[PDB]
Structures are given as structure tokens and as C-alpha cells.
Design a protein around this nucleic acid. Structure first.
Ligand SMILES: [Mg+2]
Ligand SMILES: [Mg+2]
Ligand SMILES: [Mg+2]
Ligand SMILES: [Mg+2]
Ligand SMILES: [Mg+2]
Ligand SMILES: [Mg+2]
Ligand SMILES: [Mg+2]
Ligand SMILES: [Mg+2]
Ligand SMILES: [Mg+2]
Ligand SMILES: [Mg+2]
Ligand SMILES: [Mg+2]
Ligand SMILES: [Mg+2]
Ligand SMILES: [Mg+2]
Ligand SMILES: [Mg+2]
Ligand SMILES: [Mg+2]
Ligand SMILES: [Mg+2]
Ligand SMILES: [Mg+2]
Ligand SMILES: [Mg+2]
Ligand SMILES: [Mg+2]
Ligand SMILES: [Mg+2]
Ligand SMILES: [Mg+2]
Ligand SMILES: [Mg+2]
Ligand SMILES: [Mg+2]
Ligand SMILES: [Mg+2]
Lengths: 210, 147, 203, 102
RNA sequence: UCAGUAACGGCGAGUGAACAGGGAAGAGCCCAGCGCCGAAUCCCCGCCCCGCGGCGGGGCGCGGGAAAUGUGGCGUACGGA
RNA sequence: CCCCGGCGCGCCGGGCCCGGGUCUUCCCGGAGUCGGGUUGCUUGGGAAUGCAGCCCAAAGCGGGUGGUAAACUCCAUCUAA
RNA sequence: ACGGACCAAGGAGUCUAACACGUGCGCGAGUCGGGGGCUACGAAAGCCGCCGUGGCGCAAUGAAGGUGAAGGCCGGCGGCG
């Protein structure tokens, strides 16, 4: 029964919730198990980077996050094509490929193409047969220095373009941001109806004319 | 801890703090929010006006990312840049104003609560309030709209 | 390109040709038993695009299932409960008649592996389905890498766990906003996740 | 005058140079090839027309187009699917008139 | 985490997800079809060499069968020949 | 001190006779399924989220999705059985 | 009026979740790593900082489209008078 002032509460405990309680006492054990598998995986694939294949740069969807870039799933076939990397060869040298992803704009495309060219420049490639090097294999002098890389490959960061202070021009002072904003909403709101009214008037005037 | 609680003090006192007459019974009055329009009506009306009924339009598949618009008032505007940014601009003679990009700080709309220092500034933002634009213009600043 | 013509022909099920074949074939299927080993696929094009291959170790069975809904098997129609659960007629079974057909083939031929099935006929009483099964121990199957997957014990009785194409359609699987019920792999998997109280150590 | 990109209006959005590329190949699904057309025209010669299409074509002969659409829609289900079917049956009818004229 | 939220509900009692974002992990592929290749494909029996407690490798049979009512190779929407 | 395994290096008998780019010419798809009506169940899914029965029953610049039924019209995004 | 023949031992406001207020501590327009990761007691503790995503707080209001938080004086001009 309610008693004086308070909040009205609706706990979701009307089922057999005690039959499905998930405790977390195995949490330290999971952390050790996952860590022990990261290490055993890093040893297995050494000297390949422990983090995994290089990932592209992508912009997060929606207006809440489109100011941020993060690691994608894989490089697009257009990005790989522009960088001259065969799509089936890309995975064999630690490049992640995403055939689903599209490139709508050039800047994002060229950002990931430079990424692939920079990664290709840091790639140390061991010959398939150690004793018999081949055309693209790295020289022996840089194979000695090859060491496993920790952390994501070429980590992705959000870098802001610092704009230095500048004298404000009379044209910026005279700009009306709020009036511009309010009129932009109104024009978008009334665009369809205005054209419909305009079209009828043309027909309305034409019928009298002819 | 159980040693600091009433039960330890209620040993030997028969009823245990629930009375000899009314006793502690299972669920008098109902369970949960029962009776809201009935024997519990005074409590609900007195403390929860508006609780019963419906108001306004429904919206299916609401996506709260579409209405994302963090706001900042003008009185906190200069905290988005460094302290030396303000003093260097204040004391410089060429008249160059620093650019404050609120979107970089994580805000979209600029609001007008507060008073600005007497110092020109260029403010970039997706949105402005009317009073924010005038206060920014009153100090010799300029509003810049970004997308 | 004959399979192209046959496929298009079997799309004209109300043409004079196809109506005559469906009608007489349905008559013939009706004089046989509800479970009947077929000598070859009555629909070679439809069978093969469902995985059937014309090699030893692939077999066809024709299953007859009674048409209609599911009556509640309660005596004298009494359900002994609240009015919301009094229905006896007009109730429907959660799985298709094609799925029931595959299950009846899979249960009979417990040593085979149901692969897929397809529609071959129906009248007001029966629907007829041909089921594609595989013998998982024939060396024509075990020595082919592309069919070794279905010899694994994890693929026993696919039709009985909603794994075939017909069976999996009643499980509400799929990508997107229409299939939230089965995020996690199944309806119960989504339910357990949504109905389990996570009590972290530090809470 | 001074103009800025805006998050509202008819030209809203951050400005990015649009890249033009070959459309994904999956986007030609359902495009009619000359060979598939030949096979479908052949099956029509072998098979013919379904009874509801024959009844719908009787309506179109007497120019009862509104009733022809209503009959077809009740059979196929949707206005758009019925419009396509009505046009196709009209083209069949018009083609037979031409053949008779020849 | 979104979120006891959008929504459902004698709109009462009650019920109630998803997307985005951050992480764990990370891997991608194959047919039918459309075609080209002399069925180029497969199963089993008999003999010889090898291996043989996971029954397979090679060679030889005008040995048997399957399979043109379609096996195999190339190839599958990221296009392919 | 025993055994099992894993990782390496050689010989024998086999199989493969293997790729990239630019042009030229060609080819390209899963049907009593989709979709629609209705019934029952189911979902937060609300002029109907999913599933099922019965009836109707496809198309090919088509089809599906685009969270309020419908017509017209642009777009975006995928490519079901 | 009901229970109690007698003795021993056992025997009843707990734990989880949510909320409110009070109090104590830390930091403070901020604060919180809880999930994740790094490095016998120890499943502990320590660390992360381009792991602060995210929660709560820092802005309210409207069903919503949306909007979103002091003024005066001096001098000059335009208009009314
Ligand atoms: Mg009380
Ligand atoms: Mg007392
Ligand atoms: Mg008390
Ligand atoms: Mg008492
Ligand atoms: Mg009482
Ligand atoms: Mg009393
Ligand atoms: Mg109580
Ligand atoms: Mg059920
Ligand atoms: Mg499995
Ligand atoms: Mg379906
Ligand atoms: Mg909250
Ligand atoms: Mg429920
Ligand atoms: Mg997500
Ligand atoms: Mg990871
Ligand atoms: Mg083929
Ligand atoms: Mg695909
Ligand atoms: Mg498919
Ligand atoms: Mg039920
Ligand atoms: Mg329900
Ligand atoms: Mg709409
Ligand atoms: Mg008494
Ligand atoms: Mg007594
Ligand atoms: Mg307190
Ligand atoms: Mg321990």
C-alpha cells in the first residue's frame, strides 16, 4: 500500500526470476581464460600483429555520432581496387576486406586508400620458403628486425583542425544565424505545398487565357 | 550489518513492532499499485496527479539519436577553449577573434543564459538561440553555422 | 537449358497442361500409402536446386499429409480453464504441413538424413510432398567433400529440430526489424537473455 | 551573400564530394534478358492463360477496364500488381487484334 | 549501455524490445541455374605393389553397375565466362 | 626412467599443369513461393511483429523493406522462397 | 474465554531488487570504471585516460512541429507630434 509521498514503482519480479539469476562469480576466471587465449594466439601467429588484420576508417552513422570515426569491418572493394591490392590477396597479408561496404564520397575513399598505402609501406613480408626469396619479399636485413605489434594496427584517432584566430569580417558580423535557421526550416516545410499552389495558379491563369 | 538493525532490539517484545491489534498480516490493501482508482485514490490523487489517462501523440519506432542535441549556455562558452586562448585574445591588439567550435566540445545548440566577457569571438555551431546570437553579436562576435 | 523451361512451365499451374498433370498425378498418389519410396524425383529441376544430385545415396520419398488445421485433442471439447483457452476448432499448428511431411519421412528412415522437400500435389484432403534424403554412409557421399558435412552427428534428424528449409520457416528467424523475437538464435534464446537477471559481483 | 552548411533546410547536411562508381551487380536482379524472355514467351505458347486471366480479358474486350482492374486486384491482391497484369493482358489483346488484321 | 525507455495494456494491474555507441571474438564460403568441355564423374568386384586397430594410395582387368530424367571440372551476384 | 603428442628436415610414387591488368563479345539466378483476403495463435509491434491453416495467386528496369490504412510520385537500401 | 503435564535441543522481519529521506566519507560542475583491458594469501590488490562509450548531474517547456532562461543611461539620426 502506498504510504505518504513517494514514487510509484513497478518492479519486474512477477515471474520465477530466481530460476534465471545469472551470477558473475566466474568473472575473474573468464578474464584469465580470455587473457590466456590472447597470449596463446599471439604466440601462434607471431610475428603477425596480435590485434589482427588492419581495419579501415569509417564514420559512425546518425547525427549523434557522425562527428566520430572508428575502425570499420573491412576495406571496401573500391578502396582495395584503387590501392591496387587484389581482394583475395588482401587477407593473406593481414588486410581485412568488407565486400558489403560502399563508398559514397571520395574523401572517405581516399582516406582509406592512403591508409592501405601506409600499411603496405610498413609491411615486412617473409618469403614463403625462407631460403628462396621472391619478388615482393622484404630484404633479409629488415626481416631480422621484424617484431610482433601490440595494440590495433595504426590506431584510428579523431584529429581536429585547429583554426587560428582571425579578424572578424563585416560579412560574418552581418550574418543572421537564427533568422537563417528559422527561414530554412520554413522553406523546407512549405516547399511541397508552395509548388502545388504555384502549379494550380499556372493552370488557373492558363484556363482564362485560352 | 544485521547487528545494527531493529530486529536485534525487538527481541522479547511479542509483536515485533507491528502492534497487538492490527498485527502484521500478509497483504492488506492489495499488492503493488492496486486500488489506485479505489481505496487508494487519495494517495494517488494527492501525490501523483496526472497518473491516470492518456495525453498526446504516439510515436512508433522512436530513435533517440535523431533528436540528439546537447546544449551549452553562453556563460560556459569560454570553458571549451584553453585559458591562454582567452587571455591572449583579450590582450592582443590586431583584433583577431578566436574560434570556439562547440561541436568539437560535444554540443550542437548554443543557448543564451549568461553574459559574455567583453571580448570578440567566432562561434561555430549547428544551432543558436535568438538571444545567444544577440549576446554573441553584442561583444563583437560572429555566429557560424556548421552541419 | 531444359531445366529453365521446366521451371517456367511449373510456374503455370493453372494452364491446361499443368492442371491435367497435377490432377491425374494427385489421383495416382492417392491410391498409394502415406509413405512411399519414389524411384526418381518427379520434379528433377526443383529437386536439384534444393540440393538433390543424381547419384547413389540420394533417395526420394513421397509423403501424404492430411490438410487442415489442428483440433485440440481434449475429450468432448472440454479444456477446463479460463475462456481464453476454450478453443477447440480453428486452432492452427505452429509448423507447416511440408515440415510435418519431412518429419514423417525422417522418423521412418532413421538411418537416412533428410535434406529438403518440395510440393508435388494436393487435393481437398491431402498434400503431397517429396522428401530428399541422403544415406550418410554410402561412399559416394562420404568421399565427396561437398557432402561430407551432412554425415556429421550434429546433423542427425534435421527435420525434427527445425533445421531444414521447411522446418526453419516456423522459427521466426531472419535479419532486421521483423524478427526481434529470435535475436540470439531462437525464441527461447531471446527469452532467456531478456528474462535473466544479471547480478554482477559489484552492483 | 554569406551562406553556411546547415543541419536543417532543403540543402541540409555535411558537404562531401560524391564519388560515382559502377552500381553493385546485385542491383540488376530481375532485369529481363533476351534469352529469359524467349523462354517465357515459349511457355506461354505451350501453356496458355489461366482462367482468371481469360475472364479478365473478356472484360477488357468490352472495354470494362474499371471492372477488369477490380477483378484482377481481387485475384492477385494489390493495386500495383493488378495494374501490371491489366496492362499485360491489354497488350495480349491488342496483339491479337493486330494478328487478326494481318 | 540504450532502458523500465519507444510501445503494449478492463491504457488498470501489469508488460516491454530494437538501432546507434563501447567492448569479447572475428572467417568466410558452396550449389542449382545460365554455359563450355567426347561423362571429362562416381560406386563395387577380381589380381599385383605399399599400408594395414581410422580400410586407404598406386597399377592392371573388351570386369559389373550408377549416371544424358545430368556426374565431374570452370563459375555464383563481391559479378562471371 | 617409460609412453603419447606436437613442430621441423629429406627420399619414393602420384595429382596440378595453374596467374594479373586493359580492351572485345557474351551470360546472369531458387513458384502453390512471394503477395493478397480471412481465421487462430503470438509479439512492445499499435488499420495487424512473427507463425500457421484455408481461399486467391504473381512479376521481371521485377521483387522485398523504408514502424499509420490508401492512390500518385520521387528517392534510399537489399536481393527471398 | 482459548493454548500450556513435565525436561532438553531446534524454532519466526531475512536476502535480492527498486525508491525516498536522514547520516558518514571522497571528489566537486562534475563525478563514477561497475563492462573490458594491462600487469599460498590472490577470485585479491594495483593500473588504464585517445578505454568516460555510458549513467546521473549541468535546462526547461510543449501533444507536437519547435522554441529554450536581466537591463538602463549618454550621444546621433528617421518617423509621429
Ligand atoms: Mg502502513
Ligand atoms: Mg513496549
Ligand atoms: Mg513499527
Ligand atoms: Mg500478534
Ligand atoms: Mg492494520
Ligand atoms: Mg481493527
Ligand atoms: Mg508487510
Ligand atoms: Mg505455441
Ligand atoms: Mg552447428
Ligand atoms: Mg513465408
Ligand atoms: Mg535512464
Ligand atoms: Mg509476456
Ligand atoms: Mg549495436
Ligand atoms: Mg576486440
Ligand atoms: Mg550448373
Ligand atoms: Mg550475397
Ligand atoms: Mg537465395
Ligand atoms: Mg496459445
Ligand atoms: Mg500476448
Ligand atoms: Mg508512412
Ligand atoms: Mg479462539
Ligand atoms: Mg489443553
Ligand atoms: Mg546522502
Ligand atoms: Mg583463492
Amino acid at each position: 500500500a502506498p504510504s505518504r509521498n513517494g514514487m510509484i514503482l513497478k518492479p519486474h519480479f512477477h515471474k520465477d526470476w530466481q530460476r534465471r539469476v545469472a551470477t558473475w562469480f566466474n568473472q575473474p576466471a573468464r578474464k584469465i581464460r580470455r587473457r590466456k587465449a590472447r597470449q596463446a594466439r599471439a604466440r601462434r601467429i607471431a610475428p603477425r600483429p596480435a590485434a589482427g588484420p588492419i581495419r579501415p576508417i569509417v564514420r559512425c552513422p546518425t547525427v549523434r555520432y557522425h562527428t566520430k570515426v572508428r575502425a570499420g569491418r573491412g576495406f571496401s572493394l573500391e578502396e582495395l581496387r584503387v590501392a591496387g591490392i587484389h581482394k583475395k590477396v588482401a587477407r593473406t597479408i593481414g588486410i581485412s576486406v568488407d565486400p558489403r561496404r560502399r563508398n559514397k564520397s571520395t574523401e572517405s575513399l581516399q582516406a582509406n586508400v592512403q591508409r592501405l598505402k601506409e600499411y603496405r609501406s610498413k609491411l615486412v613480408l617473409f618469403p614463403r620458403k625462407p631460403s628462396a626469396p621472391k619478388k615482393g619479399d622484404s630484404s633479409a636485413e629488415e626481416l631480422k628486425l621484424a617484431t610482433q605489434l601490440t595494440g590495433p594496427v595504426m590506431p584510428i584517432r579523431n584529429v581536429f583542425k585547429k583554426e587560428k584566430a582571425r579578424v572578424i569580417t563585416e560579412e560574418e558580423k552581418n550574418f543572421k544565424a537564427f533568422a537563417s535557421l528559422r527561414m530554412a526550416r520554413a522553406n523546407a516545410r512549405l516547399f511541397g505545398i508552395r509548388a502545388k499552389r504555384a502549379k494550380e495558379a499556372a493552370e488557373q491563369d492558363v484556363e482564362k487565357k485560352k | 550489518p544485521s547487528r545494527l538493525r531493529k530486529t536485534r532490539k525487538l527481541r522479547g517484545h511479542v509483536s515485533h513492532g507491528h502492534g497487538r491489534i492490527g498485527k502484521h498480516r500478509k497483504h492488506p490493501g492489495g499488492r503493488g499499485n492496486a486500488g489506485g482508482m479505489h481505496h487508494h485514490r487519495i494517495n494517488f490523487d494527492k501525490y501523483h496527479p496526472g497518473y491516470f489517462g492518456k495525453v498526446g501523440m504516439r510515436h512508433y519506432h522512436l530513435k533517440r539519436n535523431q533528436s540528439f542535441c546537447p546544449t551549452v549556455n553562453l556563460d560556459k562558452l569560454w570553458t571549451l577553449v584553453s585559458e591562454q586562448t582567452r587571455v591572449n585574445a583579450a590582450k592582443n591588439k590586431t583584433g583577431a577573434a578566436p574560434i570556439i567550435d562547440v561541436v568539437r566540445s560535444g554540443y550542437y545548440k548554443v543557448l543564451g543564459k549568461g553574459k559574455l566577457p567583453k571580448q570578440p569571438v567566432i562561434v561555430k555551431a549547428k544551432f543558436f538561440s535568438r538571444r545567444a546570437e544577440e549576446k554573441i553579436k553584442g561583444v563583437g562576435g560572429a555566429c557560424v553555422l556548421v552541419a | 537449358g531444359a531445366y529453365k523451361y521446366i521451371q517456367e512451365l511449373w510456374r503455370k499451374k493453372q494452364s491446361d497442361v499443368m492442371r491435367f498433370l497435377l490432377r491425374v498425378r494427385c489421383w495416382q498418389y492417392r491410391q498409394l500409402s502415406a509413405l512411399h519410396r519414389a524411384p526418381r524425383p518427379t520434379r528433377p529441376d526443383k529437386a536439384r536446386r534444393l540440393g538433390y544430385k543424381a547419384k547413389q545415396g540420394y533417395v526420394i520419398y513421397r509423403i501424404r499429409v492430411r490438410r487442415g488445421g489442428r483440433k485440440r485433442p481434449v475429450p468432448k471439447g472440454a479444456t477446463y480453464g479460463k475462456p481464453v483457452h476454450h478453443g477447440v476448432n480453428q486452432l492452427k499448428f505452429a509448423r507447416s504441413l511440408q515440415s510435418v511431411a519431412e518429419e514423417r519421412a525422417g522418423r521412418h528412415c532413421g538411418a537416412l538424413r533428410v535434406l529438403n522437400s518440395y510440393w508435388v500435389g494436393e487435393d481437398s484432403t491431402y498434400k503431397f510432398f517429396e522428401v530428399i534424403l541422403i544415406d550418410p554412409f554410402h561412399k559416394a557421399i562420404r568421399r565427396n567433400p561437398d557432402t561430407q558435412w551432412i554425415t556429421k552427428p550434429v546433423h542427425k534428424h534435421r527435420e525434427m529440430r527445425g533445421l531444414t528449409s521447411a522446418g526453419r520457416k516456423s522459427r521466426g528467424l531472419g535479419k532486421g526489424h521483423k524478427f526481434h523475437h529470435t535475436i540470439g538464435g531462437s525464441r527461447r534464446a531471446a527469452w532467456r537473455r531478456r528474462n535473466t537477471l544479471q547480478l554482477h559481483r559489484y552492483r | 551573400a554569406l551562406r553556411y552548411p546547415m543541419a536543417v533546410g532543403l540543402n541540409k547536411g555535411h558537404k562531401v564530394t560524391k564519388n560515382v562508381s559502377k552500381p553493385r551487380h546485385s542491383r540488376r536482379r530481375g532485369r529481363l534478358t533476351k534469352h529469359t524472355k524467349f523462354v517465357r514467351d515459349m511457355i506461354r505458347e505451350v501453356c496458355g492463360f489461366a482462367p482468371y486471366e481469360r475472364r479478365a480479358m473478356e472484360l477488357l474486350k468490352v472495354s470494362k477496364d474499371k471492372r477488369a482492374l477490380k477483378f484482377i486486384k481481387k485475384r492477385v491482391g494489390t493495386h500495383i500488381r493488378a495494374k501490371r497484369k491489366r496492362e499485360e493482358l491489354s497488350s495480349v489483346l491488342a496483339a491479337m487484334r493486330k494478328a487478326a488484321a494481318k
